Amino acid sequence: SHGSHETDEEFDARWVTYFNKPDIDAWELRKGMNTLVGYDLVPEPKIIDAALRACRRLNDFASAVRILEVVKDKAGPHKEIYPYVIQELRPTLNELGISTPEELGLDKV
Amino acid sequence: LTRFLGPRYRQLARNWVPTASLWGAVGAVGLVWATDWRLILDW
Amino acid sequence: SHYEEGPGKNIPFSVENKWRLLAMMTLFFGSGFAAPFFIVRHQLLKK
Amino acid sequence: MKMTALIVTIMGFMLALELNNTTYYLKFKYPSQTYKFSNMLGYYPSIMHRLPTYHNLSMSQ
Amino acid sequence: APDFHDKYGNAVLASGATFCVAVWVYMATQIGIEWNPSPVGRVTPKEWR
Amino acid sequence: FENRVAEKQKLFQEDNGLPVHLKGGATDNILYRVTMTLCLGGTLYSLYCLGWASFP
Amino acid sequence: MAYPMQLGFQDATSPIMEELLHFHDHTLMIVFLISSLVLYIISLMLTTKLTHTSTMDAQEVETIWTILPAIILILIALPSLRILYMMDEINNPSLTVKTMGHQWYWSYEYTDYEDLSFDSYMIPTSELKPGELRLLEVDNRVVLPMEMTIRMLVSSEDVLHSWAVPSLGLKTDAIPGRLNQTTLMSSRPGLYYGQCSEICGSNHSFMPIVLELVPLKYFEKWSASML
Amino acid sequence: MTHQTHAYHMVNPSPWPLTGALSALLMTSGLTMWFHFNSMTLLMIGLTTNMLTMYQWWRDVIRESTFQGHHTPAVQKGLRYGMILFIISEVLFFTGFFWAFYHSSLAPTPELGGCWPPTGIHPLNPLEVPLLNTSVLLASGVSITWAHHSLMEGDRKHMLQALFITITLGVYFTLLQASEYYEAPFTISDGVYGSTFFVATGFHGLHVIIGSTFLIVCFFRQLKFHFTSNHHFGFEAGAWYWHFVDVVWLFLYVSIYWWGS
Amino acid sequence: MFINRWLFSTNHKDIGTLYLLFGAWAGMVGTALSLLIRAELGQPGTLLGDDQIYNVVVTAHAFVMIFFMVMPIMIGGFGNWLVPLMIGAPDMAFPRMNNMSFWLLPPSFLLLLASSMVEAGAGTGWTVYPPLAGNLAHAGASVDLTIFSLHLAGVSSILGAINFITTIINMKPPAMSQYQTPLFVWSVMITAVLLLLSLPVLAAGITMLLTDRNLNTTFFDPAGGGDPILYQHLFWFFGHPEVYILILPGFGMISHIVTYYSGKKEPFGYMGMVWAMMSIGFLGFIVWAHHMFTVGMDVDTRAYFTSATMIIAIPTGVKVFSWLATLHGGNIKWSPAMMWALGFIFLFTVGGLTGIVLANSSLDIVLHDTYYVVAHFHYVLSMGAVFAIMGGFVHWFPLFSGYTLNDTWAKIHFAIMFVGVNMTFFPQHFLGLSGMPRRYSDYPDAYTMWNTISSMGSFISLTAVMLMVFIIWEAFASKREVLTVDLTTTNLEWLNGCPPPYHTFEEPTYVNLK
Amino acid sequence: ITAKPAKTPTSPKEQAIGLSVTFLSFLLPAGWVLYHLDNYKKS
Numbered sequence A: 001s002h003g004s005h006e007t008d009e010e011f012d013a014r015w016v017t018y019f020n021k022p023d024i025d026a027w028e029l030r031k032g033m034n035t036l037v038g039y040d041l042v043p044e045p046k047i048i049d050a051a052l053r054a055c056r057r058l059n060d061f062a063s064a065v066r067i068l069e070v071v072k073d074k075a076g077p078h079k080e081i082y083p084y085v086i087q088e089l090r091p092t093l094n095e096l097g098i099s100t101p102e103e104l105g106l107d108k109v
Numbered sequence B: 001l002t003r004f005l006g007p008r009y010r011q012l013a014r015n016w017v018p019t020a021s022l023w024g025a026v027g028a029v030g031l032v033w034a035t036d037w038r039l040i041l042d043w
Numbered sequence C: 001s002h003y004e005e006g007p008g009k010n011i012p013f014s015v016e017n018k019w020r021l022l023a024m025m026t027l028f029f030g031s032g033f034a035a036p037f038f039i040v041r042h043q044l045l046k047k
Numbered sequence D: 001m002k003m004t005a006l007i008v009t010i011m012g013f014m015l016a017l018e019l020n021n022t023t024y025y026l027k028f029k030y031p032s033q034t035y036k037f038s039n040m041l042g043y044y045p046s047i048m049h050r051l052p053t054y055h056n057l058s059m060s061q
Numbered sequence E: 001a002p003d004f005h006d007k008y009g010n011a012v013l014a015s016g017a018t019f020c021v022a023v024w025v026y027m028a029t030q031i032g033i034e035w036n037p038s039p040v041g042r043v044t045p046k047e048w049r
Numbered sequence F: 001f002e003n004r005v006a007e008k009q010k011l012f013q014e015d016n017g018l019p020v021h022l023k024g025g026a027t028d029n030i031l032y033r034v035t036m037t038l039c040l041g042g043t044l045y046s047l048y049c050l051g052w053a054s055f056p
Numbered sequence G: 001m002a003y004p005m006q007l008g009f010q011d012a013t014s015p016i017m018e019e020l021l022h023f024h025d026h027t028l029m030i031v032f033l034i035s036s037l038v039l040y041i042i043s044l045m046l047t048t049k050l051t052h053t054s055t056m057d058a059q060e061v062e063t064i065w066t067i068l069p070a071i072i073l074i075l076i077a078l079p080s081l082r083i084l085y086m087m088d089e090i091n092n093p094s095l096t097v098k099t100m101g102h103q104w105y106w107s108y109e110y111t112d113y114e115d116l117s118f119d120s121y122m123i124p125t126s127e128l129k130p131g132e133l134r135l136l137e138v139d140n141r142v143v144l145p146m147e148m149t150i151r152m153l154v155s156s157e158d159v160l161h162s163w164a165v166p167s168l169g170l171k172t173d174a175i176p177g178r179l180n181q182t183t184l185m186s187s188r189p190g191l192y193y194g195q196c197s198e199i200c201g202s203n204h205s206f207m208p209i210v211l212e213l214v215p216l217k218y219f220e221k222w223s224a225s226m227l
Numbered sequence H: 001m002t003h004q005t006h007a008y009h010m011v012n013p014s015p016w017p018l019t020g021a022l023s024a025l026l027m028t029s030g031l032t033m034w035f036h037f038n039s040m041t042l043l044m045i046g047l048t049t050n051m052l053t054m055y056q057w058w059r060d061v062i063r064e065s066t067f068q069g070h071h072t073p074a075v076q077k078g079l080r081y082g083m084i085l086f087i088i089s090e091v092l093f094f095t096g097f098f099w100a101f102y103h104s105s106l107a108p109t110p111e112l113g114g115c116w117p118p119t120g121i122h123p124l125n126p127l128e129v130p131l132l133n134t135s136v137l138l139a140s141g142v143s144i145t146w147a148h149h150s151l152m153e154g155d156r157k158h159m160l161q162a163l164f165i166t167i168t169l170g171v172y173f174t175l176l177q178a179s180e181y182y183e184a185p186f187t188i189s190d191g192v193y194g195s196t197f198f199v200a201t202g203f204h205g206l207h208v209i210i211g212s213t214f215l216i217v218c219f220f221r222q223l224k225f226h227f228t229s230n231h232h233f234g235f236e237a238g239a240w241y242w243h244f245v246d247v248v249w250l251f252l253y254v255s256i257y258w259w260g261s
Numbered sequence I: 001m002f003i004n005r006w007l008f009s010t011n012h013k014d015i016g017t018l019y020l021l022f023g024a025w026a027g028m029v030g031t032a033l034s035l036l037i038r039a040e041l042g043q044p045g046t047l048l049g050d051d052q053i054y055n056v057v058v059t060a061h062a063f064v065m066i067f068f069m070v071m072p073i074m075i076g077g078f079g080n081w082l083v084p085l086m087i088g089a090p091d092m093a094f095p096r097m098n099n100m101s102f103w104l105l106p107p108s109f110l111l112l113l114a115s116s117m118v119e120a121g122a123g124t125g126w127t128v129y130p131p132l133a134g135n136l137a138h139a140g141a142s143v144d145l146t147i148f149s150l151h152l153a154g155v156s157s158i159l160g161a162i163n164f165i166t167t168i169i170n171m172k173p174p175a176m177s178q179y180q181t182p183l184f185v186w187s188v189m190i191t192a193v194l195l196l197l198s199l200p201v202l203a204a205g206i207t208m209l210l211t212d213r214n215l216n217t218t219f220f221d222p223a224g225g226g227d228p229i230l231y232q233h234l235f236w237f238f239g240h241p242e243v244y245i246l247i248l249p250g251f252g253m254i255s256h257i258v259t260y261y262s263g264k265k266e267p268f269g270y271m272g273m274v275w276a277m278m279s280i281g282f283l284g285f286i287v288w289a290h291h292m293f294t295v296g297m298d299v300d301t302r303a304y305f306t307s308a309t310m311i312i313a314i315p316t317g318v319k320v321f322s323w324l325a326t327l328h329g330g331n332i333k334w335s336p337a338m339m340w341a342l343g344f345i346f347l348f349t350v351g352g353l354t355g356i357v358l359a360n361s362s363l364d365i366v367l368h369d370t371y372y373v374v375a376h377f378h379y380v381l382s383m384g385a386v387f388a389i390m391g392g393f394v395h396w397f398p399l400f401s402g403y404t405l406n407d408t409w410a411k412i413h414f415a416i417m418f419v420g421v422n423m424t425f426f427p428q429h430f431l432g433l434s435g436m437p438r439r440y441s442d443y444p445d446a447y448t449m450w451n452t453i454s455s456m457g458s459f460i461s462l463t464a465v466m467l468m469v470f471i472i473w474e475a476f477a478s479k480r481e482v483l484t485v486d487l488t489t490t491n492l493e494w495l496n497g498c499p500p501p502y503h504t505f506e507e508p509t510y511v512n513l514k
Numbered sequence J: 001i002t003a004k005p006a007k008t009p010t011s012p013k014e015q016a017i018g019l020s021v022t023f024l025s026f027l028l029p030a031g032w033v034l035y036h037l038d039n040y041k042k043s
C-alpha cells in the first residue's frame, strides 16, 4: 500500500476485474465509479465496458447512461476524447441496447 | 435558640422576607414623610 | 430539557414575525453604530 | 421642490405594486387591524349611523 | 423557465453601471472637493518674495 | 468524628427536579436571592456613578 | 519634504537614505515577484474543468516551497543587515547638537563651546507668509553645517516623542531620562522637513522639524547671533 | 439519546458565572471609585458578592462530585489538565515581575545613583527573617507531602495532623512577612526598588493566603470524610498550588532578597 | 426559562451564539469609530478637534475591533459552536466556567465605554504607553478604566483558553489521535496556548502601569529609576502573539472552506499544515522587539529581531501554497464563502509580504510610525482576519440557524466590500512611504489626494456592513429551511442536521481502534 | 446545500422596505450628530 505503486496496465486491469465481478451489487458499482472519477484520467474504453456490462447485470439502464456522461465530463476541454471512447464502445452500446446521452437528448439544456 | 434553628425551616423564612420585605418598604415610606429629606423629596 | 428545538428556536430573540424582527435588528445594530457618534458629541459638549 | 410631486407618486406605484404582486404568492394570512379599519371606510358610517340615529329615534318615542 | 437573472440581468447591469458612473463623476467634479493634484505641469509658479 | 456523606449523597441524588444550587434546601434559596440582589443593585449603583462622573 | 500625489520615498538628502531607496527597490522587486506569482497560480487553479479530487502526494513539492522562500530571505537579509550596521557605524562627528522633545515643540541645544539653546515651534497656519508650508513651518529652524558629520542626541522632557527627518532617513524616539544618539550627514544644502513621529497628546500633529543646512561659515555666524 | 452513554458531566444551569462576572465589574469599577472619588462602598459590595459566588460555585462543585458522583475518571483527568494550565498562566504572571526587577537591577539608571541597590535604600538581610521564611515554606513542603501520603494510605488522623502542621507554617510565614513589611525601612513609594519589591513579594504574599484558605477548605472536607484514599483531587490541586507557592518564594529569595540587595 | 437558557447557560452552542451576537454588535461600534477616523482625515483641516478627541477615537477603534469583535467571534463564537461538534464531544470540559468567559465581556466593554465618557477619555493609542498614559499627562479615571476593561477581557480569554485546551485534548473519541482532529480544532488549540502564555504578561504590565499611577510606584518613571521602555517590552511580548492569536483561527476556517468548496475530502498536506501553525505560534513568541526598532537598542539585538521575524515567512508560505495545492484538482463551487476564501489568500499574502518589508530594522527606521504600517495591518486584519470571519459566517450560518442566506445578495456583499477595503487601504502605502505619520488628526497639504480617496473607500465599506445586516434579516424573514448538505462524510459538524439539537453526542460516536 | 422554499417568502417590496429601514437606522442618528457638529464645537 504505502510506497507500493502500480503501472497503468495494472491499474486498468484492476478496474476491469473489479467491474466484472459477477455478483457485483449496486453499492460496489457506485463505489467503483464514484472512486474512478476522483483520478486524473478518462477511463479506458475497456474499463467503461466492464462497467456498462455490470449495469446490465444489475438491470440498471440509467446508471449506464450516467456513466457515459461522466466519461465526457472528465475529458474537460479535450473534445477528441469522448468520440474515440464512444467509438470503441459502439459494439457494446448496440449489443446491450444502450443509448448515448446525446441520443437521449440529455446533452441539451 | 438552638431549638429554633432547623434544616427544615427556610421556606417560611423565604416567605417572611417578601412579607417582611414588603413591610420594610412601608417603613421607609412612612419614615420619609416625617423625615422629609430634601434628597428624598428630590427622588 | 424543556428547551425547544429547531430553526428559529435556538436563538434568544423571536424570529416569528419578520417585522417585529426588523424592528429589533434595527435597534440592536442601530444603537451599536450610533453610540460612538453620541460619545463624541458628549465630549464636545463639556466645560 | 419640483421633484417631490414625482417621487411621491413613484413611491406610490412601487409600494402598491410590489405589495399587490406579493398578494399573488399563496400563503393565507388573515387581515391586520389596519386593513379592517381602512376597508371599513374608517368605521365611520357604521358608528355615526347606527348610533346617533338610534338615540334620536328612540328619544322621539 | 427564466430566472430573475435571465430577465433582469442586463437591465440591472446596465442601469446600475450607469447610475454609479453618473453620480461619482458628479461628486468628483461638480462639488468643491480638493484633490490637490501635482502642480507639476498644471501650475505656473508665482514669485513669493 | 461523623461521616455522613451517605445522607447528603441521598439528599442530593433525590429526584426533585431541582438544580444543584438549590437541591440543598431553603438556605440555598435565600443565599441565591441575596447574592442576586446585591449584584443587580451594585450594578445599578455602578451605572449611576458612571453617569455622574461622565459630567464635569 | 513631500509633494502632491507622491508614491514612494522623499528624495534622499543623505547617503544612508540613498542606500535605503536601493534596498527598498530590491525588497519591493521581490514582493512584486511573489505577489504576482501567487495571483497567477490562483487564477490557474480556478480555470480548468479537469478534476483530480482523489488523494495527492504532499511533501515532494513541499521541499521546493520551503527551500525557495528560505533562499529569498537571505537575499533580503544580507543587504538589510549591512545597511543596518552601516548606520550604527564608527564615525567621528565634528559637532554635537541635542534636541529635547516637549509637549508641543522641540528645543535644540548646541553646547560644545557656548551654551546656545532655542525653541522650535510650528508657525500657526494663520500667520504663514505666502509660500510657507501649512503644518510644517517652524519659527526657529535648526541650522547646521552641510557636508559635515553631526551627532544628534535625542531625549524628551516629558512624554515620549520621536524626532524624525525622512529626507535624511532619520527617526529616533525621544524617551525621557534617555539620550539616544543618531548621526546626521546631509550631502546638500537646503530646508529639510520632518514631524513628531510618536503620539504625545493634543498637539501631536503640530510640532514639526525643519532642518536648514548652510555652509560652515554661515553656520557659525548664525550660531553667534543666536548667543 | 435521553440517557447519556459518555462518562462526562453536563452541569446544571448556574447563575454563578453571571454573578461572578457582575462581581468583577463591581470590584474593578469599585477600585476606580476608591482611587478617584475616594469611595469604597462599591469596592465593598463587589468583594462581598465575589465571596458569595466563590462559596456557592465551589459548594456546588463539591455537591456534584462527592454527593452526586459525577466525577468519573474522564472528568477527573480533565480537572488535572485545567489546574496545570491555570498554574502555568500564573507562572507567567509572576514572570512579568521578575522581568521588571531584573531589568531595573541589571541596568540601574543614573537617577538611582547609577548603582544597585539605589543609594539611600537599606535592604533587609537575607540571612535574618528572609532565611526563616524560606525554611518555613520549605518545611510545609515536606509536611504537605506527608499529608498526601497518609491520605492515600487511609490514615485519617495523620493526614489531619500533617495538614494542620502545614497550614500553621503557612500562617506563620504570613505573620512573619507581615511584620517584615511593617519594619522595612523602605516603602512602595521608594522608587523602583520599593516598587519592584513590594509588588512581587506582595502578590506572592496574596498567593500564600489564597493557598492557605484552600488547604483550610481541604482540612474541613477531610473532617467531613469527603476524601477517599483514591479520589481527592481537591487535595491534589491544593497541594500543587502550594508547591507553586514555595517555588515562587525560592526565586524571590534568591533574586530580590539575596542577589538584588 | 429564558433566564435559565440565556443567562444561566452551560451549553456550548448557546454560549457560542451569545458570542456571535456580542461580536456583531461590537462590530457596529468599531465600524462607527473607523468612520469618524476617516471623516476627520477626508479633507485637510480639523473636523472633530485636537489629537486628544481624535486619538480617543483611534484607541477605542482598536480595542473594540481587536478585543470585542474579532476575538469574541472567532474563538468564542466559532470556537464554542464548532469545536465540540468537530471532535464528537457532548460539550466542553467546563460548561459553567465557559459561561463566565462570555459574561465577563459585556462588563469589560462597559468599562471601555465608560473610559471615553469621563474626563477626556484615553487618547493614548491602543498600546497605552507611559508617560502619556501616566497620571500626569492623562490624569483621571479614563486610563484606569481602560486598564480594568483589559483585565477582565484577559481573565475572560485565559479562562476560555483553559477550557479549549482541556476539551480538545481530553474529550475526543478514544480511538482518535490528535493527528486525526481537523485543522480548525488544531487552529484553536494552538491559539488557546498563545493566549495562556501571553495574556498574563500583559496583565503583569498594565498592573504595573496601574500602580505607577495610583500607588506611587515607579516601574516606568525615570524619576524613581523606572524605564518607559520596560513597558514596551512587556506589552509587546503579549502584543505580537496577540496578532497571531488573531489570524490562526482564521487560517483554520480558510482550510475548511477551501477544502469544502474544492470538493476535496481533506486539505493538501495536513501534517505540513499542523507543523506550519505550530512553527508560526512558536516563532511568534521570540520576535516582539521588531516593534521597537527606533527606541535606541543595540545594533546586534536589532539584527537578531529582524532575522527572527523573517523566518516566520517560511511556515506561513507552506500554508499559502498548501491552500493553493488544495484547490488544484478540485471541482470548484463559486459560493460566497469560496469568494471570501480566495480574497483572503491573496490579500493576506500581500499584507504579510508588506510586513516582511517592515521586518527590516534599517528600512523600518524610516517606515515606523507611518501609514505604511497602518496599511500592513489593515490588509492582514480588514482583508485577512475579517475575510475569514465572513467566509466562515456565510459558510456555517445554515448550521447555526437552520435557515439559508440569499447567495446572490451574499455575493453582492462581497463585491462591495472587496472594492471598499482596497480603495481604503491601498493609497495608505504611499502616504506612508511619503512620510505621513500615524495618529495625526491633520496632515500637510501634500497628503490630501490619497487621504481623500482613502476616506471614500471607507464609505463603500460602510455600505457593505449595512447591507449585511439586511442580508441576515432577509434570511430570517424568508425561512428557507435546510434540506441537504454535501460532503458530510468528512465534515462532522453537519451530521446532526441544521441546527443541531441542544444536546448532541448524548450517546457517543463509534470509532474503531484498527 | 439545498433548502425548502421559504415558509414565509419576502417579496421585493418587502425587501425594499427592510433594506431602506436598515439603511436609515444606520444613517440617520449619525447624520444628525454629524449635522450639528459645529453647534457642539461652539457650545
Ligand code: HEA
Binding pocket: G034, G068, G069, G070, G072, G073, I243, I244, I246, I247, I290, I291, I293, I309, I310, I312, I313, I314, I316, I317, I318, I320, I348, I349, I350, I351, I352, I353, I355, I356, I358, I359, I360, I364, I367, I368, I369, I373, I376, I377, I380, I381, I384, I385
Ligand atoms: C493578524 C494580523 C497580523 C499578522 C498576521 C502580521 C504578520 C506579520 N507582521 Fe505585523 N502587524 C500587525 C498585524 C499583523 N502582522 C499589527 C496590528 C501591527 C501594528 C501594531 C502597532 O504597532 O500598532 C503590525 C506591525 C508590524 C511591524 C512593526 C511596524 C512598525 O511599527 O515599525 C512589523 C515589523 O516587523 C510587522 C511584521 C510582520 C511580519 C513579518 C508578519 C508575518 O507574519 C507575515 C507572513 C506572511 C507572508 C510572508 C506572506 C505569505 C508567505 C509566502 C507567500 C512565502 C514566500 C514569501 C517570502 C519569501 C517573503 N508587523
Ligand code: HEA
Binding pocket: I020, I023, I024, I027, I028, I031, I034, I035, I037, I038, I058, I059, I061, I062, I065, I066, I069, I070, I073, I124, I125, I126, I127, I374, I378, I381, I382, I385, I386, I389, I390, I393, I421, I424, I438, I439, I440, I458, I461, I465
Ligand atoms: C480587527 C482589526 C481592525 C479592523 C478590522 C479595522 C478596520 C478599520 N480600521 Fe483600523 N485599526 C486597528 C484595528 C482594526 N481596524 C488598530 C489595531 C489600529 C491601531 C490604533 C492605534 O494606532 O493605536 C487601527 C488604526 C486605524 C487607522 C489609523 C489611525 C491613525 O493612526 O491615525 C485607520 C485610519 O484609517 C483605521 C481605519 C480603519 C477602517 C477604515 C476600517 C474599516 O476597514 C472597517 C470596515 C468594517 C469592517 C470590516 C467590520 C465589519 C465586520 C463586522 C462588523 C463583523 C460582523 C459580524 C458578523 C458577520 C457575525 N484604523
Ligand SMILES: [Cu+2]
Binding pocket: G101, G102, G104, G160, G161, G162, G196, G197, G198, G199, G200, G204, G207
Ligand atoms: Cu511629540
Ligand SMILES: [Cu+2]
Binding pocket: G161, G162, G196, G197, G198, G199, G200, G201, G203, G204, G205, G207
Ligand atoms: Cu507627537
Ligand SMILES: [Cu+2]
Binding pocket: I239, I240, I243, I287, I288, I290, I291
Ligand atoms: Cu509584531
Ligand SMILES: [Mg+2]
Binding pocket: G197, G198, I369
Ligand atoms: Mg512608536
